[PDB]
Amino acid sequence: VTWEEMRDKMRKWREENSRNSEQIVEVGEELINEYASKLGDDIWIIYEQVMIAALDYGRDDLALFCLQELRRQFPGSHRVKRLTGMRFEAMERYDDAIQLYDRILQEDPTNTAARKRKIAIRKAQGKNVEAIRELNEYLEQFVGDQEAWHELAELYINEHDYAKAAFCLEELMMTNPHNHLYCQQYAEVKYTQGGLENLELSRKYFAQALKLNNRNMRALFGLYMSASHIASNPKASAKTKKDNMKYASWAASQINRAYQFAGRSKKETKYSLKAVEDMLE
Amino acid sequence: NPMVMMMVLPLLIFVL
Amino acid sequence: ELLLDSNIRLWVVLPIVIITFFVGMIRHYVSILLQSDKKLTQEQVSDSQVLIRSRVLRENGKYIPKQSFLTRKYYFNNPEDGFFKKTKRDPTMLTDMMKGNVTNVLPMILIGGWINMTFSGFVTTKVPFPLTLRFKPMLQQGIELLTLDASWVSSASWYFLNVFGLRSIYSLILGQDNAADQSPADTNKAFKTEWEALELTDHQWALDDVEEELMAKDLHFEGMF
Amino acid sequence: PSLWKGLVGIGLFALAHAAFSAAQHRSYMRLTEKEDESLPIDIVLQTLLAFAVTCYGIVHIAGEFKDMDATSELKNKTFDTLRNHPSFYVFNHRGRVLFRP
Amino acid sequence: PFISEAAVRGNAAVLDYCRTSVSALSGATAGILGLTGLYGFIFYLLASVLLSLLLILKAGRRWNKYFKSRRPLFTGGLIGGLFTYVLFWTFLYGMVHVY
Amino acid sequence: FKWAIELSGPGGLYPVGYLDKQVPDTEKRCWDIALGPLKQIPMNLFIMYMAGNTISIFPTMMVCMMAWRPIQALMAISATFKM
Ligand SMILES: CCCCCCCC/C=C\CCCCCCCC(=O)OC[C@H](COP(=O)(O)OCC[N+](C)(C)C)OC(=O)CCCCCCC/C=C\CCCCCCCC
Numbered sequence: 109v110t111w112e113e114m115r116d117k118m119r120k121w122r123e124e125n126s127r128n129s130e131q132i133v134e135v136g137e138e139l140i141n142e143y144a145s146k147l148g149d150d151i152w153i154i155y156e157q158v159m160i161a162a163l164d165y166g167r168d169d170l171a172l173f174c175l176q177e178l179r180r181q182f183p184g185s186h187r188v189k190r191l192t193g194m195r196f197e198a199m200e201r202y203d204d205a206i207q208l209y210d211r212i213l214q215e216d217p218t219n220t221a222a223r224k225r226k227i228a229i230r231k232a233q234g235k236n237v238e239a240i241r242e243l244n245e246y247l248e249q250f251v252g253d254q255e256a257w258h259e260l261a262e263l264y265i266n267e268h269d270y271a272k273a274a275f276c277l278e279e280l281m282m283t284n285p286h287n288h289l290y291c292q293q294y295a296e297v298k299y300t301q302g303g304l305e306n307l308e309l310s311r312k313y314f315a316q317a318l319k320l321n322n323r324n325m326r327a328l329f330g331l332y333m334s335a336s337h338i339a340s341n342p343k344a345s346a347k348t349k350k351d352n353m354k355y356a357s358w359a360a361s362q363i364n365r366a367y368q369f370a371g372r373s374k375k376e377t378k379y380s381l382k383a384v385e386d387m388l389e
Numbered sequence: 390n391p392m393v394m395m396m397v398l399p400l401l402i403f404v405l
Numbered sequence: 406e407l408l409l410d411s412n413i414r415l416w417v418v419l420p421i422v423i424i425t426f427f428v429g430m431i432r433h434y435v436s437i438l439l440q441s442d443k444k445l446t447q448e449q450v451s452d453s454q455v456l457i458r459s460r461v462l463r464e465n466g467k468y469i470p471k472q473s474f475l476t477r478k479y480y481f482n483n484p485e486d487g488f489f490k491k492t493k494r495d496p497t498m499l500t501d502m503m504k505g506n507v508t509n510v511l512p513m514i515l516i517g518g519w520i521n522m523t524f525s526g527f528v529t530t531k532v533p534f535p536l537t538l539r540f541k542p543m544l545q546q547g548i549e550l551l552t553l554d555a556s557w558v559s560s561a562s563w564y565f566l567n568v569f570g571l572r573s574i575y576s577l578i579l580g581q582d583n584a585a586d587q588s589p590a591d592t593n594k595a596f597k598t599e600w601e602a603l604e605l606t607d608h609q610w611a612l613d614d615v616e617e618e619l620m621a622k623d624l625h626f627e628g629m630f
Numbered sequence: 631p632s633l634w635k636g637l638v639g640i641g642l643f644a645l646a647h648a649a650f651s652a653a654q655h656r657s658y659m660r661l662t663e664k665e666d667e668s669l670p671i672d673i674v675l676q677t678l679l680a681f682a683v684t685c686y687g688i689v690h691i692a693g694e695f696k697d698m699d700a701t702s703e704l705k706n707k708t709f710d711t712l713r714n715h716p717s718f719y720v721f722n723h724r725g726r727v728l729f730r731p
Numbered sequence: 732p733f734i735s736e737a738a739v740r741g742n743a744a745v746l747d748y749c750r751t752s753v754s755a756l757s758g759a760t761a762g763i764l765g766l767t768g769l770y771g772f773i774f775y776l777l778a779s780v781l782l783s784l785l786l787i788l789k790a791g792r793r794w795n796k797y798f799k800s801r802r803p804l805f806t807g808g809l810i811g812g813l814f815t816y817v818l819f820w821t822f823l824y825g826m827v828h829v830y
Numbered sequence: 831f832k833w834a835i836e837l838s839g840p841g842g843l844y845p846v847g848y849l850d851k852q853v854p855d856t857e858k859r860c861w862d863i864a865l866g867p868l869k870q871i872p873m874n875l876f877i878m879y880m881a882g883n884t885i886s887i888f889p890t891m892m893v894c895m896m897a898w899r900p901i902q903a904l905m906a907i908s909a910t911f912k913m
Binding site: 472475476477478479480483486543 | 847849852853854855856889
């Protein structure tokens with residue numbers, strides 16, 4: 109347990125956007141208290157996460173410390189300005205945060221952080237419709253922002269306009285063909301959206317996600333259940349009926365195999381057997 | 390420098 | 406051979422290498438210091454990102470069903486939709502870019518000239534391969550010899566060989582694609598060429614045969630632990 | 631392992647020693663002026679062995695290759711991470727109220 | 732399948748680093764041995780294929796996911812290696828055999 | 831299915847790129863691509879030849895000219911064919 113090890117752990121926990129605020133805030137506090145001078149400016153990015161975790165963790169005592177250090181180091185910085193905006197939003201102080209973001213925008217119009225923070229404020233206030241409208245307007249100038257695209261898709265899913273969410277996930281897959289998570293989420297959204305005309309797309313995209321990653325057993329039994337629903341639908345044609353029955357049988361075989369592997373990996377009561385007891389039904 | 394001129398003429402040639 | 410003065414090594418051989426190495430480092434650091442991003446307004450970045458989205462769609466729309474793709478096509482290149490139709494609009498910048506382009510080679514040649522004056526009249530090192538006699542006037546600047554072997558080189562060309570052979574070292578230590586070496590503007594035409602290209606593009610839903618190519622082999626499952 | 635790095639160091643040292651030997655041998659000729667015109671077998675064997683070991687170490691020092699298939703490092707990315715969207719964080723959750731304000 | 736630009740760039744960078752280091756070392760060794768003329772140049776080629784063999788050992792089995800083909804292992808940046816090889820060759824042959 | 835819950839229903843400007851209506855709208859060049867460099871290479875070659883003593887007084891310019899249009903084409907012959 110050396111400061112390099114926790115530094116690498118924090119770097120990994122930053123590269124993939126985790127939100128285990130307690131662990132990251134504890135590690136960051138240890139780093140900035142014990143090994144603050146053991147390494148150079150690489151802690152400064154840490155000083156971002158550490159405060160955000162604090163706002164997530166509720167421990168506001170060190171949020172002021174980190175903010176004051178960053179401000180005294182970086183006067184008139186748009187990143188630190190957004191960070192102050194988040195500090196203000198931590199206590200639902202929305203008017204001052206909005207004014208600060210407007211000042212940032214009038215100082216620099218190409219900044220994208222201020223728009224995202226202001227729409228985060230709007231969605232925190234519960235005005236979902238105006239938040240969706242603001243995101244739609246913001247994308248009209250910044251088509252291609254994958255993060256905002258996925259956030260808009262998630263908001264549409266929450267508000268249950270599954271057509272727009274499916275469209276946004278389609279264009280997200282356009283952006284990133286090789287991410288199986290997007291394919292799985294789009295298959296789920298399409299399955300939830302409607303019937304056979306969308307069930308076919310859902311099962312095709314579930315198969316695509318399985319091809320892109322064999323371990324996504326979530327999408328595995330998602331494909332299984334989509335095929336089963338297609339089978340149970342009277343409108344399915346005879347050739348479609350036998351095709352989806354074959355797909356369901358293959359998926360069931362894969363599910364029994366996967367749960368047998370789950371069995372050999374652990375050592376306990378055979379709940380996985382109970383699990384395939386469900387498949388036999 | 391004659392050498393500098395004779396080696397910077399290609400530099401103008403290299404740019405063009 | 407030739408009994409060259411030992412003091413030529415400690416003051417004409419090593420200092421040339423050190424000068425070349427650290428001048429390359431200086432040039433790279435000055436290049437990164439000088440580079441400043443030009444201010445971009447909303448419209449230019451917006452259209453650049455829009456054409457980025459269009460090109461990535463053209464590249465990998467195969468993973469998107471047919472109706473979504475042809476709706477993309479309607480949105481992009483079709484009178485009725487309106488997009489791609491109602492979307493269009495000594496100078497300092499030229500001098501600055503010309504100076505920046507010039508400063509990548511000219512400092513090396515000026516250093517070479519200064520070295521040629523400063524270290525004129527020596528024989529620094531013997532190039533270990535038999536260069537041609539016709540190359541004599543540039544390898545042996547500042548030497549009045551006539552029958553000297555062409556493999557003996559003066560200071561200027563030795564420095565030139567050093568600056569040619571040190572770029573790989575720069576990439577080794579400085580970082581990949583370093584700037585120490587020796588070696589869209591218009592959106593309307595871009596809009597029109599994207600129009601024509603995406604008109605020429607077709608659709609091939611890559612999911613039409615994914616299941617059959619998936620059914621053939623069992624799913625990899627080892628390493629679940 | 632890290633010892634590879636140490637290995638390459640000694641390799642360079644070996645090469646450096648070879649240089650010294652070669653220099654001395656050259657002085658030999660510069661004081662013998664005989665028709666030898668040949669390096670000692672010891673120095674050339676030492677130089678070649680140092681080259682071999684140093685190159686073998688360097689190959690390890692270069693690093694580790696990375697796979698081209700984009701679904702390699704993304705295999706372990708669970709859906710609980712990709713959904714966070716760090717720019718669009720919201721602080722109106724139960725975390726603040728539950729935890730110490 | 733789906734190539735990732737970052738990984739292929741990293742592979743190219745590590746291959747280039749290994750090639751540059753081996754070419755510089757080969758130049759130093761050829762300068763040490765006092766090789767002169769064509770016999771020197773051939774040595775470089777030999778050194779190169781030696782590195783290739785080592786790279787074949789480094790990639791080893793299952794290299795198909797590392798490179799599209801073995802070709803960049805052999806002829807990857809050969810001229811860039813040759814320039815540094817001749818520089819270090821002249822350097823060492825100058826500060827060893829000339830004086 | 832005893833747990834077939836439906837989550838669709840009410841659908842509420844429009845998101846950019848969205849369009850609700852389902853619309854039903856739906857040798858040779860290699861010779862020119864090879865002759866391009868086959869005709870551009872002599873131009874640089876002719877310029878280098880007509881340079882004369884300027885080319886002689888510019889040893890580096892000749893190498894760059896011979897590596898720009900020629901040499902690179904031979905080195906990137908596979909790339910040229912694949913393009
Ligand atoms: C007898 C003739 C032989 C000539 C010697 C040249 C070959 C010897 C080479 C390497 C052996 C050192 C091994 C130590 C491990 C270093 C690499 C590493 O894995 O460790 C990582 C760290 C930091 O990585 P990085 O970003 O800095 O590397 C650049 C990253 N990349 C390669 C993708 C661009 O490495 C660090 O500690 C920072 C230091 C990086 C390596 C410094 C060595 C370069 C210094 C001088 C080279 C020649 C200058 C003088 C010669 C003049 C004669 C003409």
